[PDB]
Paper text:
The capsid is comprised of approximately ~1,600 copies of CA molecules, which oligomerize into ~250 hexamers and 12 pentamers (capsomeres) to form the distinct fullerene cone. In this study, we leveraged the approach of templating the [name] CA lattice assembly on liposomes, together with stabilization by the small-molecule host factor inositol hexakisphosphate (IP6),75–79 to produce regular [name]-2 CA lattices.
In the initial stages of map classification and reconstruction, a subset of pentamers were observed adjacent to the central hexamer. Pentamer-containing particles were re-processed with C5 symmetry to reconstruct an [name]-2 CA pentamer map to 2.97 Å resolution. The icosahedral pentamer was nearly identical to the pentamer from the CLPs with a model root-mean-square deviation (RMSD) of ~0.7 Å. We observed density for IP6 in the central pores of both [name]-2 CA hexamers and pentamers, with clear density for R18 side chains. While the 58TVGG61 loop of [name]-1 has been described as a molecular switch between the pentamer and hexamer, the 58CVGD61 loop of [name]-2 does not demonstrate such a significant structural shift, though it is still structurally distinct between the two conformations. Furthermore, despite the lack of M66 gating in [name]-2, we did not observe density for either the CPSF6 or Nup153 peptide in the FG pocket of CA pentamers, indicating that another mechanism is responsible for the reduced binding to [name]-2.
Author numbering:
A (entry chain D), B (entry chain B), C (entry chain C): 1 to 221
The structure:
Amino acid sequence: PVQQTGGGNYIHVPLSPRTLNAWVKLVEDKKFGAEVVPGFQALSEGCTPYDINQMLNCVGDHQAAMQIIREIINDEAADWDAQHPIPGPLPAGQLRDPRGSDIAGTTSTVEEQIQWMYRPQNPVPVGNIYRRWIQIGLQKCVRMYNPTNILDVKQGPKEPFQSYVDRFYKSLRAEQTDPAVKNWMTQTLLIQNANPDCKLVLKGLGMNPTLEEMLTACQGV
Amino acid sequence: PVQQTGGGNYIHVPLSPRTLNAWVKLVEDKKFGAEVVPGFQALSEGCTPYDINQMLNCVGDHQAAMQIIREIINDEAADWDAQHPIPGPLPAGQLRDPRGSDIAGTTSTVEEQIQWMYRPQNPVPVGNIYRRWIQIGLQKCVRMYNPTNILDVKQGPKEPFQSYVDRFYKSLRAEQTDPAVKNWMTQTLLIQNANPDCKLVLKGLGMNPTLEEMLTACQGV
Amino acid sequence: PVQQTGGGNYIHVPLSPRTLNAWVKLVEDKKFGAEVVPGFQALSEGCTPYDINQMLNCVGDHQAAMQIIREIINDEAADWDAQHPIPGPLPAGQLRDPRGSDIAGTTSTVEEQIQWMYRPQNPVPVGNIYRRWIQIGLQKCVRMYNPTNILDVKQGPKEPFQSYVDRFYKSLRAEQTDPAVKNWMTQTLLIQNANPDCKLVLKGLGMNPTLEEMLTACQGV
């Protein structure tokens, strides 16, 4: 994070321990759930890569997926050298041009990143690009760890349909499939993977039903 | 949210972690009680849409209801477009009168959301309008989740009358009936749906009894 | 069918008796299967609606699916009536411009159908339009009749993967699903709903195996 100073200049201001601690608890309590990506972004909002790295480095308990997150980040950096035509050399006394690794933080400091994040001639984000690389790694972890998949989400006679619907959408959310497939899944697979009593009730509800009407209708099973 | 610096300038700020955390707990622990609507407003009071979405996108349980809220928001934006003239050809370089998904903030950036909130030409307060759309979705869920209903709420023979009242009013609230219906229900259905022993006493109090008088007299029956 | 003779003089002929019979048998035996849609066309190519109406009528055993086809023809004709309305008072020496019902062949005579089909001003092949309207009705029936759905198709333990994929694919076509959904099911639902022994053998293939490679690999499994 950075604090502006009189004259239009900026200085580094450290990230809060509570924010770092809150990130670790979200990772452990939710076990790399799908909600570990968005909460992280808010906790890491207006931050540089240097501070973001600390949070990721603070945890050593789960390093199987933090290692996967690392692979994707350097992959984006490897791709970054071509995505951005190499700028070439500039005179001495001027800031260096940012590369893939500078975005990751394996090499650069918070001040160089602060100067890049607040450069009047060529302002460049180094932490929005990096957090995105981390988030792409975080999402792969969610899908790899997801316990039961959408096709296997099913309702038992005892299970109330509502409960089965929450599990189905949570899994559908963990996956990032095309919306069209989701529509076929949310209108067909949902009625299909139900207890047969309420499935017949959903046939009574009609064709092209809505979630409010499906939930209101099977209120009792 | 929004932070205004000297000179009339406006900037975006992160949303505090505890506010996100408190919103998450209220949604899950209260199982979408009727206080998850106001609990959302206070925590989101004076914030930008970009940070709201996050709060709603940091919760992984009761996800089916979150899908209902998403649909309601889309519909409000549809009506907004119908009631807001597409300005059409506009001076290029003029902040675009925000459209439907520019109030929700999905198709727009936080800065222009802040710029519309205080736009000198025609400020569009994106924040209050979007929170209201979400609130309507939250309110539908409270009703759908509500376990029982006012008509079926009935004092147990051995159950005390006051407990029946706590159950009755909580539902006269969860079911958001018009105030006139509320007066009629409170003046009558709290006596009709009661057990006979206390009902006679409530009739003995006199016509238009008041709740203080009804609770005091039926105390210990 | 129709038959030009001299001076471009088109005339009417009888529809072959073994063509009416073949349509009946294709329908009675394939039970309105998917191939009924094209088999109909090959047996009705160049036939006017009148003769097509005789073929469909000769089938008297199945009359619920034929009604579904009939309900659809009425609609298509009502969209050709609204969008192509009565021209008005046609000048002397003109024939009423073809309407949707004339395309159906219920009102217009075979001669009038031929006059429009070869009309120098309105050469509208009434036959191919009615044939197209019928296909849609036949296709709804195929989807409505198909015995086993894709989610309900699962390989038998004593059955091969190739036999199961054939039952699975036949169904995908009867369901007539969107192409994006088709790819997901074909690359996934064909493995999830497979004998566990061959499912693991479809994992050693790699990622996105092709059907050519999926079968050869599970050959004897």
